[PDB]
Amino acid sequence: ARGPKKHLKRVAAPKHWMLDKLTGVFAPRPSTGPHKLRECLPLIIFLRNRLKYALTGDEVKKICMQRFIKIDGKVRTDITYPAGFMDVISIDKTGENFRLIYDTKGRFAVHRITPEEAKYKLCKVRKIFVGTKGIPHLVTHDARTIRYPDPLIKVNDTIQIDLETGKITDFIKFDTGNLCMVTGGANLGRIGVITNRERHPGSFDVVHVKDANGNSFATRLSNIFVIGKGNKPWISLPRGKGIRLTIAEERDKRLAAKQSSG
Amino acid sequence: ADIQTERAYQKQPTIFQNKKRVLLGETGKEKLPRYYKNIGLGFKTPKEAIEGTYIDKKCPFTGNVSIRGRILSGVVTKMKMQRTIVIRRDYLHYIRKYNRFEKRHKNMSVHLSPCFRDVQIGDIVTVGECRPLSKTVRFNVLKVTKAAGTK
Amino acid sequence: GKCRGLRTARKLRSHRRDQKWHDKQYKKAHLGTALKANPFGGASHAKGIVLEKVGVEAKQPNSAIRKCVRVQLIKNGKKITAFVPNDGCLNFIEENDEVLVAGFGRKGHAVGDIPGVRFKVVKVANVSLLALYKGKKERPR
RNA sequence: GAAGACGGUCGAACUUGACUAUCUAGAGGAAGUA
RNA sequence: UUAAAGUUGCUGCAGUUAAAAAGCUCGUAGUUGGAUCUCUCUCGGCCGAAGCGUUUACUUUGAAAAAAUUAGAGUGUUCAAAGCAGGCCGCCUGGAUACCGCAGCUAGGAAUAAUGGAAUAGGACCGCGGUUCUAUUUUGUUG
RNA sequence: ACGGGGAAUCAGGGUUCGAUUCCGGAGAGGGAGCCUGAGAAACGGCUACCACAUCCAAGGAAGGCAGCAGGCGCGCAAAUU
RNA sequence: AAACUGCGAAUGGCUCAUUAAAUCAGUUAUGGUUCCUUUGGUCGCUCGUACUUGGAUAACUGUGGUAAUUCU
């Protein structure tokens, strides 16, 4: 190419958007924004493919252009605006609030939350620097910078934002015994307790996580998001509790849902 | 003499060396303070690095390089260039049809700091990846272990 | 016997790819001299101008005259004798005709009785010989 | 502040050679081909 | 063009007479090579941080590996090739999973196969000694 | 010979194909040089030379389908201005 | 409407000629770089006519040239 690309073919779109083959050649191609385009939901896919409020992209244009969608407390008229992990999508007209949280199969769930919960979110601090007359700074996982954080906040911690002010209320430290969600790789969407972290210098660290049923899995350090302190999550968790069932017991649950219902 | 062999004055760029002083230190002990650093992967800086007098801008311990990337190791074959040697890395390549292997090798021109004096051929160097130092040089000698017979 | 050791992969495959050239099928289809001698140039069919009708005499343990056609190809100007299959099919062929020529079946070798003929006629004046033989079409005027 | 000019650089192309290759006009002939 | 072709042979061919073994010995690379040897230190909370143990190959694990395609789960496109949908009387449920050689990462194993270590002792483990430079704690403060 | 993902065949091992809708590269007749711009050595931008080629009142002016159609050619071989 | 200004025209589409450690694939790195846009930060931090500054130029009007152009 002679410059940056603007299209996305539909087959090369991310798998967890769950687009299908035959409706078009192109995928929505997210705008640049706070989240990575392999790691986001564009607002057009959330609003007609997940919520079924629209049937075309033209109707998503009509819904968004009435200024009806607030993502993290601000109105977005962009239909390909990249919403991402733990963003609060709040539709005021229908009185719904949503948070984007991965399912146990690594896709964003349609997780409804109460408007008490819709005033905060958790972020993961990715960078700390001191800049220009000794003012300390944060950089979170969704491109927020915060001036003057608490000096105990370090890289890989998890802070809590109030969505109106933008300021930190409190935070969790990165330690063994805290609760996780995996935000990357094979183990994506799983939830458990930190038990170990082995440090390889010059390369990626590996964190071992233990499930609520005693299953254990590793990730890398960058695929780790500290949800809660100890065992209590600071947010509401989706339908499955981050416990990935095997295919045999998922089949057993799906068959037990048919011999009882009907 | 003994450093200044080139047409330009060789000096460590981080150390200021014309600090004026009174005659009780101007005549007493004359020592240029040496710049050195600690590269980070468990490698310890040699003794000849922190007390020597050589000036090499490409040395991993007293120069301006960083070591990041791949740690490898080879065996010294040629020591014939200025401050850079040629190592040989032997490996086995699996051919799948025959379920078997063939001996291949690759050469690497690698930069050798003057803090590793008494480096023979036939002995094992550990090399670390740095930024491109030349047209064909990308690695840097970090640790020398002798051959099997040199007691 | 052959080497068998765990590090003999270079000796094994460089011997096989050098003994592969002693096979007739590999040497034919991987050297390039046989493709430059093939008048079709690797094509399945070709087209030429009929220069003259030619009677070729059958080989010894039987006796007849096979009704061939000397045809000069369009795309490279090479000349070719080609066999006209059924009876009274040489009557359908004028001279200076467009003709479509196929292979004769054995991939460049002469099929049994006819000596040194690798080709056969399929169309004449853009009408197939089978349509003329079974009386489905006629030669255009 | 335009035209223009000295110089430098990048540099397609042009000419004359040498070597090499191909397409075409080309006397003569030979052998085999039948 | 693939199988048939064990007529290219790694699995897996052949070399007296059918095609075929070098005139003879030496000899570099390559290939192949006889037995043999049964885990701890300071701190942080009896365990972790600090070392690894000679070094690899091997093996098992883990994570990382685009989708589509292939294998494969569900689902009566009227069946099927397909598709990713659909199912009850506003609800309910999907959109799984496997494989992805080699090279490179991680963790266990230690048989097999290489390599190392004390034979002019410049050997280990110990206390004792001497030479040179130095941490900065030490003198209500300051020099 | 554009490279991969892949394709056909297949007891097991293999052998052959991959120009071709996904990803990566390259090139817009042949070479070369540039302007603008965040990004181009861009060709549905410009300036030359080389090869072709258009309009002319003979002074001059304009060009680039390996985009969609379509035509000629080439061929064994491929669709609607 | 026009025209000035701003942005886009470097994406897409086509083809496979070149190209054999090159392209490309997996893996790593930029602590050796640049980055329109998006998103967040920053924008009385500087001790020295303003209750608003200056000259133009299109569109338009009018006179034209050339056999001829998205010429002027």
Curated annotation (Swiss-Prot), chain A:
Component of the small ribosomal subunit. Part of the small subunit (SSU) processome, composed of more than 70 proteins and the RNA chaperone small nucleolar RNA (snoRNA) U3. Identified in a IGF2BP1-dependent mRNP granule complex containing untranslated mRNAs. Keywords: Acetylation, Cytoplasm, Isopeptide bond, Nucleus, Ribonucleoprotein, Ribosomal protein, RNA-binding, rRNA-binding, Ubl conjugation. The lineage of its organism: Eukaryota, Metazoa, Chordata, Craniata, Vertebrata. It is found in: Cytoplasm; Nucleus, Nucleolus. GO terms for cellular component: cytoplasmic ribonucleoprotein granule; cytosol; cytosolic ribosome; cytosolic small ribosomal subunit; extracellular exosome; focal adhesion; membrane; nucleolus. It comes from the Eukaryota. HAMAP family: Ribosomal_eS4 (MF_00485). Residues 41-103 form the S4 RNA-binding domain. SMART domains: S4. This is Small ribosomal subunit protein eS4, X isoform. Belongs to the eukaryotic ribosomal protein eS4 family. The keyword Signal does not apply. GO terms for biological process: cytoplasmic translation; positive regulation of cell population proliferation; positive regulation of translation; ribosomal small subunit biogenesis; translation. Coiled coil: none annotated. There is a cross-link at residue 229 (Glycyl lysine isopeptide (Lys-Gly) (interchain with G-Cter in SUMO2)). GO terms for molecular function: RNA binding; rRNA binding; structural constituent of ribosome. It holds the Pfam family RS4NT. The modification N6-acetyllysine is found at residue 232. Component of the small ribosomal subunit. The ribosome is a large ribonucleoprotein complex responsible for the synthesis of proteins in the cell. Part of the small subunit (SSU) processome, first precursor of the small eukaryotic ribosomal subunit. During the assembly of the SSU processome in the nucleolus, many ribosome biogenesis factors, an RNA chaperone and ribosomal proteins associate with the nascent pre-rRNA and work in concert to generate RNA folding, modifications, rearrangements and cleavage as well as targeted degradation of pre-ribosomal RNA by the RNA exosome.
Curated annotation (Swiss-Prot), chain B:
The modification N6-acetyllysine is found at residues 37, 44, 57. SUPFAM superfamilies: Nucleic acid-binding proteins. This is Small ribosomal subunit protein uS17. It comes from Homo sapiens (Human). The modification Omega-N-methylarginine is found at residue 68. The keyword RNA-binding applies. NCBIfam families: PRK08572.1, uS17_arch. Component of the small ribosomal subunit. Part of the small subunit (SSU) processome, composed of more than 70 proteins and the RNA chaperone small nucleolar RNA (snoRNA) U3. The gene is RPS11. The modification Phosphoserine is found at residues 66, 109.
From Swiss-Prot, chain C:
The modification N6-acetyllysine is found at residue 134. Residues 1-19 have a biased composition (Basic residues). There is a cross-link at residue 36 (Glycyl lysine isopeptide (Lys-Gly) (interchain with G-Cter in SUMO2)). One of its GO terms (molecular function) is RNA binding. Coiled coil: none annotated. It is linked to Brachycephaly, trichomegaly, and developmental delay: An autosomal dominant developmental disorder characterized by brachycephaly, ciliary trichomegaly, dysmorphic features of the face and hands, hearing loss, and developmental delay with short stature. Intellectual disability and autism spectrum disorder may be present in some patients. Component of the ribosome, a large ribonucleoprotein complex responsible for the synthesis of proteins in the cell. The small ribosomal subunit (SSU) binds messenger RNAs (mRNAs) and translates the encoded message by selecting cognate aminoacyl-transfer RNA (tRNA) molecules. The large subunit (LSU) contains the ribosomal catalytic site termed the peptidyl transferase center (PTC), which catalyzes the formation of peptide bonds, thereby polymerizing the amino acids delivered by tRNAs into a polypeptide chain. Belongs to the universal ribosomal protein uS12 family. This is Small ribosomal subunit protein uS12.
